[PDB]
Design a binder for this molecule. Structure first.
Ligand SMILES: COC(=O)N[C@H](C(=O)NN(Cc1ccc(Br)cc1)C[C@@](O)(Cc1ccccc1)C(=O)N[C@H]1c2ccccc2C[C@H]1O)C(C)(C)C
Lengths: 99, 99
């Protein structure tokens, strides 16, 4: 699809059999979701935001649907303002910027 | 132009007669630039994201030129770790997300 930016680019994702609202963020190198439960082991990760770096859990090879596009990648879990879908997954669904 | 997301979508901008590199961020409501001088009146503002909030100065009706495209809008100046072009300006240059 083509998404304009007059409002927040919010879309429905599906992870762990559940639906959530997430923001397509080309400015985010990674994908970080609000506190939740994911399977397997996780690793430590420091992501830097507008106000500093925070601690987050890193799970790899996680299944996640974005606007019907199935993707499998790294998903970070932590205290983010909103669910953020980053470049690591935006590149998997073939998302590009255009003007 | 069409910009991919394999790498951060950084572009050149011209503001206040100065050339700068900035990050096209669809996950950004506003445009915030690193410490610099801008013309006119300003009002203090607090913006937040991963890591928390930072204090910035808000200047309105500021001219900007992104990849040759002239635009007008609000610009925030403060301790941001990277120059960021927010949705408030991306819309003016006709920028959209496609996949
Ligand atoms: C209403 O408030 C706002 O619009 N604030 C904006 C904002 O903070 N944007 N979002 C966060 C956010 C998204 C949606 C909503 Br709803 C609210 C906040 C994040 C950001 O793109 C900015 C950023 C980019 C580069 C360096 C540092 C920070 C970011 O944090 N990027 C990092 C990131 C995120 C997840 C995983 C890894 C990494 C690494 C880096 O790419 C504003 C302050 C620019 C205006």
């Amino acid at each position: 699809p083509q998404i304009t930016l007059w409002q927040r680019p919010l879309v429905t994702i599906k992870i762990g059999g559940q639906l959530k609202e997430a923001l397509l963020d080309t400015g985010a190198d990674d994908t970080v979701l609000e506190e939740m439960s994911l399977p397997g082991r996780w690793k430590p990760k420091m992501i830097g935001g507008i106000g500093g770096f925070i601690k987050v859990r890193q799970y790899d090879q996680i299944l996640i649907e974005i606007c019907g596009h199935k993707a499998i990648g790294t998903v970070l879990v932590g205290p983010t303002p909103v669910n953020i879908i980053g470049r690591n997954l935006l590149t998997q669904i073939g998302c590009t910027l255009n003007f």
